[PDB]
């Protein structure tokens, strides 16, 4: 509260470490469904159904331009990519499986780096 602060958790490396994680996700073999924004003209249903589209290229641009105020807003956009994928894709599809694999991969890197 006013003039009463918990000790300062060092956040000075968070930008670098989020960028490293994002690189690792970009280079995973199963990242191909997530690299670029879904083409809203060519994928029926996507525009109406997926209220907040998100992809790794869009995260990378946001990261590079100071649009994440802290590491939790970064994790929220990564999870959004996989939550969108689950909303639109059957679990037993290549893209559905890709999304489960990537979410697992991300959550381990997240825990190992920051928890």
Curated annotation (Swiss-Prot):
Compartment(s) where it occurs, according to its Swiss-Prot or TrEMBL record: Nucleus
Q: What is this protein called?
A: Bromodomain adjacent to zinc finger domain protein 2B
Q: Where is the Bromo domain?
A: 9-113
Which gene is this protein's source? BAZ2B
What role is this protein assigned? Regulatory subunit of the ATP-dependent BRF-1 and BRF-5 ISWI chromatin remodeling complexes, which form ordered nucleosome arrays on chromatin and facilitate access to DNA during DNA-templated processes such as DNA replication, transcription, and repair. Both complexes regulate the spacing of nucleosomes along the chromatin and have the ability to slide mononucleosomes to the center of a DNA template. The BRF-1 ISWI chromatin remodeling complex has a lower ATP hydrolysis rate than the BRF-5 ISWI chromatin remodeling complex.
**Which tissues is it found in, per the record?**
Expressed at varying levels in several tissues, whereas a smaller transcript was expressed specifically in testis.
Q: Kindly state the subunit structure of this protein.
A: Component of the BRF-1 ISWI chromatin remodeling complex, at least composed of SMARCA1 and BAZ2B, which regulates the spacing of histone octamers on the DNA template to facilitate access to DNA. Within the BRF-1 ISWI chromatin remodeling complex interacts with SMARCA1; the interaction is direct. Component of the BRF-5 ISWI chromatin remodeling complex, at least composed of SMARCA5/SNF2H and BAZ2B, which regulates the spacing of histone octamers on the DNA template to facilitate access to DNA.
Top-level lineage group = Eukaryota
């Amino acid at each position: 509260s006013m003039s009463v602060k918990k000790p300062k958790r060092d956040d000075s490396k968070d930008l670098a470490l989020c960028s490293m994680i994002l690189t690792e996700m970009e280079t995973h073999e199963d990242a191909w469904p997530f690299l670029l924004p879904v083409n809203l003209k060519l994928v029926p249903g996507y525009k109406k159904v997926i209220k907040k589209p998100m992809d790794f290229s869009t995260i990378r641009e946001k990261l590079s331009s100071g649009q994440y105020p802290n590491l939790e807003t970064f994790a929220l956009d990564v999870r959004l990519v996989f939550d969108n994928c689950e909303t639109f894709n059957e679990d037993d599809s290549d893209i559905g499986r890709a999304g489960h694999n990537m979410r697992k991969y991300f959550e381990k890197k997240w825990t190992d780096t920051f928890k």
